[PDB]
Amino acid sequence: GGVHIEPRYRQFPQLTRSQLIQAEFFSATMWFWILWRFWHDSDAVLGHFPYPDPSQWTDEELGILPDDED
Amino acid sequence: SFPKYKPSRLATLPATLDPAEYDISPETRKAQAERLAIRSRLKREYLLQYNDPNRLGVIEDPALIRWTYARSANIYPNFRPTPKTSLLGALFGIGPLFFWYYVFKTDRDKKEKLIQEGKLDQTFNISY
Amino acid sequence: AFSAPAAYLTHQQKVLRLYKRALRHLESWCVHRDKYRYFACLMRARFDEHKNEKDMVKATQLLRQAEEEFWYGQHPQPYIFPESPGGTSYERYECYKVPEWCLDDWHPSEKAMYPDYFAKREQWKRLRRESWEREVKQLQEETPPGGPRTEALPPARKEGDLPPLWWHIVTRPRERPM
Amino acid sequence: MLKIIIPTTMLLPMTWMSKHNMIWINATVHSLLISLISLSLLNQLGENSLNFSLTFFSDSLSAPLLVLTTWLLPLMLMASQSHLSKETTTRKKLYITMLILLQLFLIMTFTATELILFYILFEATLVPTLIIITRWGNQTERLNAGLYFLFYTLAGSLPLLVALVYIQNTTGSLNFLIIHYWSHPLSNSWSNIFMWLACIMAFMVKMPLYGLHLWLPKAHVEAPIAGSMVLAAVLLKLGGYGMMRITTILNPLTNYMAYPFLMLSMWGMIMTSSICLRQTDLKSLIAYSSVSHMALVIVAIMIQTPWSFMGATALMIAHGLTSSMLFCLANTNYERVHSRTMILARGLQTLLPLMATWWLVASLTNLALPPSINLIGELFIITASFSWSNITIILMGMNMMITALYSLYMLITTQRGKYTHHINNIKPSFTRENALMALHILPLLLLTLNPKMILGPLY
Amino acid sequence: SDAPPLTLEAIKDRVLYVLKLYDKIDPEKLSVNSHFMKDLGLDSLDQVEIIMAMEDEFGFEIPDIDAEKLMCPQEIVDYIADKKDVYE
Amino acid sequence: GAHLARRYLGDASKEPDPLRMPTFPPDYGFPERKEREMVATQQEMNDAQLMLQQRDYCAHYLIQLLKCKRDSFPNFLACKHEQHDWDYCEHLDYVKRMKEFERERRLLQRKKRREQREAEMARG
Amino acid sequence: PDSWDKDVYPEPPRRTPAPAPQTSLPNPVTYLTKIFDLLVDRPVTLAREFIEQQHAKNRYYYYHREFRRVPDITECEEKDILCMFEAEMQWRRDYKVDQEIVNIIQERLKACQQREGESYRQNCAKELEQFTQVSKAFQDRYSDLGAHYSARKCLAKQKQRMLAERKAAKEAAAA
Amino acid sequence: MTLCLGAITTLFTALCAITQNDIKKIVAFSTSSQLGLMMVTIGINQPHLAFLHICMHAFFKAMLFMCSGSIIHSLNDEQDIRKMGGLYKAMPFTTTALIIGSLALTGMPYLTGFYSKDLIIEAVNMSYTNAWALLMTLIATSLTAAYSTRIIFFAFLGKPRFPPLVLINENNPLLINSIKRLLIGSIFAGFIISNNIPPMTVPNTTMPLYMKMTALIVT
Amino acid sequence: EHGHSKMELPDYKQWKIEGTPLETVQEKLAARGLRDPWGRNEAWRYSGGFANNVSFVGALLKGFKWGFAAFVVAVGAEYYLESQ
Amino acid sequence: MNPFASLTLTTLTILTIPIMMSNSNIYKTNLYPNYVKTTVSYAFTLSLVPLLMFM
Amino acid sequence: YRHSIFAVTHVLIPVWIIHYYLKYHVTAKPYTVVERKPRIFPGDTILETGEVIPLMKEFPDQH
Amino acid sequence: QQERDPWYDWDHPDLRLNWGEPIHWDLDMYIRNRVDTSPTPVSWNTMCKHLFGFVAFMLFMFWVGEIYPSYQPVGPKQYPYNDLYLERGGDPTKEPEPVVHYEI
Ligand SMILES: CCCCCCCCCCCCCCCCC[C@@H](O)O[C@H](CO[C@H](O)CCCCCCCCCCCCCCC)COP(=O)(O)OCC[N+](C)(C)C
Numbered sequence A: 001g002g003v004h005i006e007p008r009y010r011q012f013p014q015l016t017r018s019q020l021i022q023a024e025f026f027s028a029t030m031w032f033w034i035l036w037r038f039w040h041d042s043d044a045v046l047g048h049f050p051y052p053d054p055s056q057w058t059d060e061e062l063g064i065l066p067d068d069e070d
Numbered sequence B: 001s002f003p004k005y006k007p008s009r010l011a012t013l014p015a016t017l018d019p020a021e022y023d024i025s026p027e028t029r030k031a032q033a034e035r036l037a038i039r040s041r042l043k044r045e046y047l048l049q050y051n052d053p054n055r056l057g058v059i060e061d062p063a064l065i066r067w068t069y070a071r072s073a074n075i076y077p078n079f080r081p082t083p084k085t086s087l088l089g090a091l092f093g094i095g096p097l098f099f100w101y102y103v104f105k106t107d108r109d110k111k112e113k114l115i116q117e118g119k120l121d122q123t124f125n126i127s128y
Numbered sequence C: 001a002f003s004a005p006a007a008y009l010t011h012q013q014k015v016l017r018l019y020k021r022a023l024r025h026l027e028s029w030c031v032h033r034d035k036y037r038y039f040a041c042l043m044r045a046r047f048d049e050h051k052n053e054k055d056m057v058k059a060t061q062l063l064r065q066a067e068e069e070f071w072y073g074q075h076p077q078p079y080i081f082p083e084s085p086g087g088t089s090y091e092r093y094e095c096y097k098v099p100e101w102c103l104d105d106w107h108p109s110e111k112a113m114y115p116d117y118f119a120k121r122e123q124w125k126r127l128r129r130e131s132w133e134r135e136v137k138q139l140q141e142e143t144p145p146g147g148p149r150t151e152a153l154p155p156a157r158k159e160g161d162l163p164p165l166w167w168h169i170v171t172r173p174r175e176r177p178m
Numbered sequence D: 001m002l003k004i005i006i007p008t009t010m011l012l013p014m015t016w017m018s019k020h021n022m023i024w025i026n027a028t029v030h031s032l033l034i035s036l037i038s039l040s041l042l043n044q045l046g047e048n049s050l051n052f053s054l055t056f057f058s059d060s061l062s063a064p065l066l067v068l069t070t071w072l073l074p075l076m077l078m079a080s081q082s083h084l085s086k087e088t089t090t091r092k093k094l095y096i097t098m099l100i101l102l103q104l105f106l107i108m109t110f111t112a113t114e115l116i117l118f119y120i121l122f123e124a125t126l127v128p129t130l131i132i133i134t135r136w137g138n139q140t141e142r143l144n145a146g147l148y149f150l151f152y153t154l155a156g157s158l159p160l161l162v163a164l165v166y167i168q169n170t171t172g173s174l175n176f177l178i179i180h181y182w183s184h185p186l187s188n189s190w191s192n193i194f195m196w197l198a199c200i201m202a203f204m205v206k207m208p209l210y211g212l213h214l215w216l217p218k219a220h221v222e223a224p225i226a227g228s229m230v231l232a233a234v235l236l237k238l239g240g241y242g243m244m245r246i247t248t249i250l251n252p253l254t255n256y257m258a259y260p261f262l263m264l265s266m267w268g269m270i271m272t273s274s275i276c277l278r279q280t281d282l283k284s285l286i287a288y289s290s291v292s293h294m295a296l297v298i299v300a301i302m303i304q305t306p307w308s309f310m311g312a313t314a315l316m317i318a319h320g321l322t323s324s325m326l327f328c329l330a331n332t333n334y335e336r337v338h339s340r341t342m343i344l345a346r347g348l349q350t351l352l353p354l355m356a357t358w359w360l361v362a363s364l365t366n367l368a369l370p371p372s373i374n375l376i377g378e379l380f381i382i383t384a385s386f387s388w389s390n391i392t393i394i395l396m397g398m399n400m401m402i403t404a405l406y407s408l409y410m411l412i413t414t415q416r417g418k419y420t421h422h423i424n425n426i427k428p429s430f431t432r433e434n435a436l437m438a439l440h441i442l443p444l445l446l447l448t449l450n451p452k453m454i455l456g457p458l459y
Numbered sequence E: 001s002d003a004p005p006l007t008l009e010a011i012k013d014r015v016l017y018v019l020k021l022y023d024k025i026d027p028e029k030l031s032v033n034s035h036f037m038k039d040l041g042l043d044s045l046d047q048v049e050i051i052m053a054m055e056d057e058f059g060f061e062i063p064d065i066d067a068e069k070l071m072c073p074q075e076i077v078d079y080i081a082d083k084k085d086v087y088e
Numbered sequence F: 001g002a003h004l005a006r007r008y009l010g011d012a013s014k015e016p017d018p019l020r021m022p023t024f025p026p027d028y029g030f031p032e033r034k035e036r037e038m039v040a041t042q043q044e045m046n047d048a049q050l051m052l053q054q055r056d057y058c059a060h061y062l063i064q065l066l067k068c069k070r071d072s073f074p075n076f077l078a079c080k081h082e083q084h085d086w087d088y089c090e091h092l093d094y095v096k097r098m099k100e101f102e103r104e105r106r107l108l109q110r111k112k113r114r115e116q117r118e119a120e121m122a123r124g
Numbered sequence G: 001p002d003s004w005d006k007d008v009y010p011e012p013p014r015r016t017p018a019p020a021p022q023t024s025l026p027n028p029v030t031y032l033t034k035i036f037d038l039l040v041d042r043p044v045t046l047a048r049e050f051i052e053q054q055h056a057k058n059r060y061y062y063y064h065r066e067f068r069r070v071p072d073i074t075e076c077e078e079k080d081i082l083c084m085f086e087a088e089m090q091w092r093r094d095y096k097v098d099q100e101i102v103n104i105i106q107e108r109l110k111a112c113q114q115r116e117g118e119s120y121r122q123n124c125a126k127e128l129e130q131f132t133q134v135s136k137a138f139q140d141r142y143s144d145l146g147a148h149y150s151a152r153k154c155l156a157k158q159k160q161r162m163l164a165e166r167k168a169a170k171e172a173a174a175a
Numbered sequence H: 001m002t003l004c005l006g007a008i009t010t011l012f013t014a015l016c017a018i019t020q021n022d023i024k025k026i027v028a029f030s031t032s033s034q035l036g037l038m039m040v041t042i043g044i045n046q047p048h049l050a051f052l053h054i055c056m057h058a059f060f061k062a063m064l065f066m067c068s069g070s071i072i073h074s075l076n077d078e079q080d081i082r083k084m085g086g087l088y089k090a091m092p093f094t095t096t097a098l099i100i101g102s103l104a105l106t107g108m109p110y111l112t113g114f115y116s117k118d119l120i121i122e123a124v125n126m127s128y129t130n131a132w133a134l135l136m137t138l139i140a141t142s143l144t145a146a147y148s149t150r151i152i153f154f155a156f157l158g159k160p161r162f163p164p165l166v167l168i169n170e171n172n173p174l175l176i177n178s179i180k181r182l183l184i185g186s187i188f189a190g191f192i193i194s195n196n197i198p199p200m201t202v203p204n205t206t207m208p209l210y211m212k213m214t215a216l217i218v219t
Numbered sequence I: 001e002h003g004h005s006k007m008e009l010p011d012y013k014q015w016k017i018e019g020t021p022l023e024t025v026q027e028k029l030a031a032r033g034l035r036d037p038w039g040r041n042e043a044w045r046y047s048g049g050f051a052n053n054v055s056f057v058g059a060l061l062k063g064f065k066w067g068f069a070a071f072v073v074a075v076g077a078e079y080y081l082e083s084q
Numbered sequence J: 001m002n003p004f005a006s007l008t009l010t011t012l013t014i015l016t017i018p019i020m021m022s023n024s025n026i027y028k029t030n031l032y033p034n035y036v037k038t039t040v041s042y043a044f045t046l047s048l049v050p051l052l053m054f055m
Numbered sequence K: 001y002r003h004s005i006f007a008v009t010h011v012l013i014p015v016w017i018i019h020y021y022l023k024y025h026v027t028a029k030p031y032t033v034v035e036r037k038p039r040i041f042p043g044d045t046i047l048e049t050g051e052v053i054p055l056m057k058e059f060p061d062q063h
Numbered sequence L: 001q002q003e004r005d006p007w008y009d010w011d012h013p014d015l016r017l018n019w020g021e022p023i024h025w026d027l028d029m030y031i032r033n034r035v036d037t038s039p040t041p042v043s044w045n046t047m048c049k050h051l052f053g054f055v056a057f058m059l060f061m062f063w064v065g066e067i068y069p070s071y072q073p074v075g076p077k078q079y080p081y082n083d084l085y086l087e088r089g090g091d092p093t094k095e096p097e098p099v100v101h102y103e104i
């Protein structure tokens, strides 16, 4: 199916340039996709809507009377 | 010293931890020699019958025949009614039957009482 | 495997078996090559300390503590060669092994293909048919009375002789029949 | 119904006037033709029945059993051709005569509008099977087996006869139609309890019930291949047919009286399935598996609901076919190895691959793989039992698990692994054996396409 | 697989290679028939180490009963060839 | 979380049980008591057949989101504004639920303070 | 299609939305279904036209069998076997017709559940009540007769239920 | 019961995985942990999210086994990681495919596993569940990262530890094409499918910042 | 078609301990009076293309450079296209 | 009728053709695995259509 | 050519048979093929009737 | 039979038996496909204790987490039309008690 590559016996195996170029291309493609999506849609990771502080809400908007009315 | 290994029925003692192999005496060596001699005699008989160019069938094994016969047909002539045998037979052959009878009878009595009382809710129960 | 077993293992056989087993489990623990080399040299130095011992009782007291220590620290998942009795491809190719006698049951149209192979096959069969009748006598005369004591077989001692019980050793299927 | 009975009778003169080398061919051809003729009784009615005459009637419970009975004879002839080759012509003709007589008795038994006529033919079947077992069996235990197979049966069958005649003295008839239409409730009395027991135990011993099942492993292990085939396929189903027929007059006493038999069956199916796990004999293992399946059928008949009866019919047909196939496969192994021990001949998938495929299919159908009719019957019985009591699901599930376990154990022990080295007489499988296995298995997978044909009169 | 069909010559060169990388043997005194105990002055532990080196270099392991009686490079080559079904 | 720590390691009655909330009348705090507004009707919200657990006060924004997803099919990045609108309305819903939790907790606090003040007055 | 009755198997009017494309980008579904029509629907229709005209060259009919009414088991003497046989056969035919009625209502229920989508709990209450009523009636008629059921057993069950109902009504009137 | 069974399953199988030496065993235990996580999602009443996880896991775990089989074949049917060393350079397409698969499995933003696992963890955090089940799920996420880095470290980073006769070869169009199709899947399928299916549940729009970052910090 | 090309073995004199962790192992062993005999049998694992190693983070960042360059080019192109 | 219904059943049906041809001549040659792979790929590309209709 | 004949023998013929069987035999019976009753949104028009679904209640829109 | 020497040349290599040797009564129970008795690195009692300890602690802690659940600082989810009374079970001929939701 492929090309002929002979055994090497205690040395680094013979490497075709095609496999190197494809592996590098796919790794770079994944990293580019991650960067592109982070740039375009970062609120899926960091969040978009603020989380409110329950203690910051005053008794006026929360319906609390000064402990004597009711 | 190191933590000890404790053998069990389903995790036996390793060969290299047996005190027996390290207790070597002339009687032990003689017993090993006779065991090897018996095994070698059996192996010689088997290989002689196995390499024969004229043999054209199963090499009959008396050990296998003895195994199957002992497992199947030698049981009852060697049976003896014994307190252990009688109690185990009665338990293992009667107790499960009465246990299951009690369970199913109780279940069906509860179901029958509920259906008489009408509080069973058998709606959509068409197939039985 | 090929060599016949003895009645018992000697002391030095037990020591060498423990040495091999301990080094194998040590390299299972020490994954990297240099670490294994260092600790294997340490293990060898530990073995050869009692190398010249003459007290056999004390030597047998040794190797017992050694095997207990081995069992305590034995790496419950040692490395196994794939085709070894515990490996991942131990009996993988046994389903491809077919006996040589099966060829006797081939249809003549099947034997019509491969004619040279089958001709060599009857050559082998004639060789076996003569050699066997000679081998039975050779084994009968060479065996001590009372039966064999060790399951070792003699070689061929005459000129036209063949080793006794040679057929099923010579005609093994193959390691990788397909 | 005589259009089937008369050709079966004509099988005998045709057998005895055949040439010395033409008995098997002629018998097989005409048995297959009789099966084709009998196949037209499957056209049943949603109304009462096919009442041909005062003596014989057909039902959608009777018709599948009749078709199976007719179909079994050619297969038995094919299976018996091999081990009877060195036999004299007269004795081969006598063997074929025994087979034909057994078919005739079974065919008349399954129609049999009368209960006394049914009893007479139901017991007439006992003679040819006994002769076949005690005459053409190989081992020395065959005689003993025959004795067991005889007396067990009669131990249950003599009380039934008494009860039968007693019933006719009170009712005035034993015709199934009048018995069904004029049925009256059976009071909860000691006399009625013993009448119930007399009516039931004859069919209970033949299923066999778990307590009374000892004759079956003996008879199957000792009998020749055709004897085993007919015992496992048809003769075990006589008890189920009889119970389904006779339980119509036993109500409402069945509700109380069924408890001991229900417990015996539900526990003994587990017991025999576990026994199959430790068995060194193929024939004995297949016999114990048959005992388990018939225990499930007994539970179905005792529960006595529409789904129970449908499942019982389906399971009886499916088990007949599957067990006959399993016995035939084991016999093909035995005719080569002459041992009948499971552990001896191993790794046969490497030496006989197509027969390994047959083994796989037979094990899958014994295992009740859907949508086989084995599982259709199993599931219908299980659902009926669940409605009877929700706790039965535990025992049913355990039985299913153990059944899968021993079926695949039997497959793996014989077909997988390494071949035994010293066995060198294993020849390629014959066209006769492959055709025998195919003629067992294709009808099952065809029946799964039209299940209503084997679901009985309550469909 | 795509495993080359190794030959007797290849087995012999690889065995001698592994032995020449063992610094306890000087390579110019090594030979195919040279005994381990007497021609090379090696201990039994050294022989166990050599057997393990062969096992690690050929990818299969030799049982102790067979391994303990392999005292020449030629014997090791013969054993490996018989195990691997090597023709020439 | 902190509220779990307060409830399981402090006084249980200090903070609400989420299963029994609310335990006080709605208009207990202030008398204006405006009611919530629902935009989607019964029939249109049934015709959209959203889901029973999606049928809340945010329904109309979900209707518009589904309307876009159906209309601009191949461009599955076309309507992003209505996705944001539905998310914002759901965010407001969750903020309202948080306010309800905080209000009920503070009412419980004030009720316990009134109870202890009454106890102190009784003991005095 | 005319092959079945629209009343026994009712369907809603089946309102379908109209395509309202918000973009000019070409969708694949319309083009792909157009090529599906061209490649599959047209030859299949041609083959059907040929088969239907061959059928129309040879037109023949079959009929639905009509069974008259026979006296039922309530009008049969205690041992008179001829009328008992007729009544039993009539009862069995009626039993199967009842089974088919239950099947029809169950089919209605299943179709409603699939059709109504996420709104099936509210929009299939009518079919659920129909099946509840029919299931109650069928269970009252046939639930516990068991294997070896008969018209006599069904009549006995009905009589037992009628005694219970009459006793309850007399108790309620006199309470 | 479903939630608790899923939590104990995912924890126990990840715990078994982090210490195995057979590569196929490690990947099988990873599969079992992922199935336990699916059961947890079912137990918190989120079936559509569980289906989405099934669909994403298909892609990246199938590619993981394909890479493992490539390694096994190149090393003469050897499955132990103690006997495979530096394959980062010796066979680089398998290396990059396994790295992408591990990053998708552990959960890296905008890959196929992100669009499912991130939502799984957020939903489990934002729900009325067992505290023990939540804790076990978080620890299982830790252990997932742990066994992923175990595979990478022991199979690609060190010096070679395989026999001298080097038969390493990747150059077959079948292997490369089959792996790269599932690689493209593991990169883009999550985004495409998540943006094409209609919304089946209410979103968790608002969270505490730390509790939004729980999955990433645990990983 | 199979690999029949008569492969020859390299020179055994080539394998040396210097410059490798095996040298550190030998030095540490010498401090105890010991010596490693099988060192040169293990040297080929540190000699040729196996000499250079990469870290875990370096492995994870296998193609970050080219992807980052493409990302910057793409974002610049989008910035110069939208602003028009 | 509607195309959506036909496509779903065709995928599953054409998945079974190589099983029917398992007794044919192609099963005795070395082209059978490629035949099975091609069948599965065609089934996938055919099943992509109902997915688009649902989307 | 090989792919062309493969598509005809393995896709076109099965889809022809299945479409014919579904269109002329399965749908001859009632309830055999049951659809979903597609969603209706406000502002839509129905092909069968032609009427227009009324819109929403013009809720306050901001952000 | 798993404890028998795998490197010995048995007459039945897969079962690890020789031709003439006596057969264990329970051979078919020990066939390398079934229960084996081979020694383990850890003792049987120790393994039983650890496995049991782990399972029991897990069950106890799941019960505890049931007693002490986790949730968020929110009230119940609110649904407009009488908590979707008509869409959840229905019964329109009853007119249940209205439930009014609070604007905060
Ligand atoms: C061995 C392998 C299997 C073979 C088949 C086994 C199945 C046969 C089991 C027989 C079924 C049960 C027999 C009678 C059942 C009736 C219920 C009765 O026995 O229980 C109580 C009866 O009380 C006592 O049991 C009285 C009988 C005691 C004497 C019987 C011996 C007990 C053990 C013997 C078992 C041996 C069986 C095999 C014999 C060869 C009920 O109380 P009571 O309300 O008052 O009676 C109601 C019935 N009436 C109205 C007709 C009177």
Ligand SMILES: CCCCCCCCCCCC(=O)SCCNC(=O)CCNC(=O)[C@H](O)C(C)(C)COP(=O)(O)O
Binding pocket: C011, C012, C013, C015, C016, C022, C025, C026, C029, C046, C047, C048, C049, C050, C051, C052, C053, C059, C060, C062, C063, C066, C067, C069, C070, C071, C073, C074, C075, E043, E044, E045, E046
């Ligand atoms: C990680 C797993 C844990 C493993 C821990 C195991 C414990 C290690 C320490 C072992 C203790 C011992 O040395 S055990 C001491 C046992 N007694 C003797 O050694 C006395 C005489 N020695 C011999 O005979 C040898 O065979 C010899 C001469 C060396 C070679 O012989 P050759 O001339 O035939 O090569």
